[PDB]
Design a protein around this ligand. Structure first.
Ligand SMILES: [Zn+2]
Lengths: 202, 6
């Protein structure tokens, strides 16, 4: 259960300094989406911002010192207006999430079945712990109500990264210091992503 | 700084 059922309710209940919506619009067909950024699913902000060097980006960040879990709105309820505009303006969506798990794992889902499979293969061959989720797996990212699928095509890749995998990418795992302590593994991972996105979406 | 997506 989320604390809030939609963005309007969150906005009505939370101080605006405690969260932040950030966009980068470049006209690229692909949109990188991180609706659980900041301290909600830590590290998804940093991955998104790095990929924004080449792609359009939507980011929703929890900015509290603690308790950002209350700002999580699940994808099928996430209706912040700038996200609705950005998703609808793009052809494809890559959506970044984090789930609680100490082992390093990357779970890949989404509606774009051939691209999701390719990504898993590329990640595996590059030495990263990716698995493909299929359509009946929980949190497979296939609902039409999922914000990531409200694009021009409906084709998405949903990347869920375990806590252990995200913690491996930063010297200090905090809101304050993740961005400035990105390590060699962080750039190795995002370079595999850059290579995949450029090849996969021509 | 809180971890979850259908
Ligand atoms: Zn999430």
């Amino acid at each position: 259960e989320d604390v809030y059922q939609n963005f309007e309710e969150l906005k009505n209940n939370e101080d605006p300094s405690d969260y932040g919506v950030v966009t980068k619009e470049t006209g690229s067909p692909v949109l990188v989406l991180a609706i659980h950024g900041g301290g909600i699913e830590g590290g998804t902000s940093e991955v998104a911002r790095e990929l924004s060097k080449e792609y359009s980006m939507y980011l929703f960040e929890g900015l509290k010192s603690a308790g950002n879990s209350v700002l999580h709105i699940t994808s099928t309820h996430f209706d912040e207006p700038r996200a609705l505009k950005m998703t609808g303006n793009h052809e494809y969506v890559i959506s970044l999430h984090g789930y609680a798990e100490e082992d390093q794992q990357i779970e890949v889902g989404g509606t774009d079945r051939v691209r999701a499979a390719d990504l898993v293969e590329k990640l595996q061959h590059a030495g990263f712990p990716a698995v493909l989720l299929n359509m009946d797996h929980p949190h497979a990212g296939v609902s039409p109500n999922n914000i990531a699928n409200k694009s021009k095509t409906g084709l998405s890749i949903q990347i869920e990264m375990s806590t252990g995998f995200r913690k491996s990418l930063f010297g200090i795992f905090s809101l304050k210091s993740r961005a400035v302590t990105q390590n060699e593994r962080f750039y190795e991972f995002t370079e595999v992503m850059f290579r995949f996105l450029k090849n996969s979406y021509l | 700084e809180x971890x979850x997506x259908x």
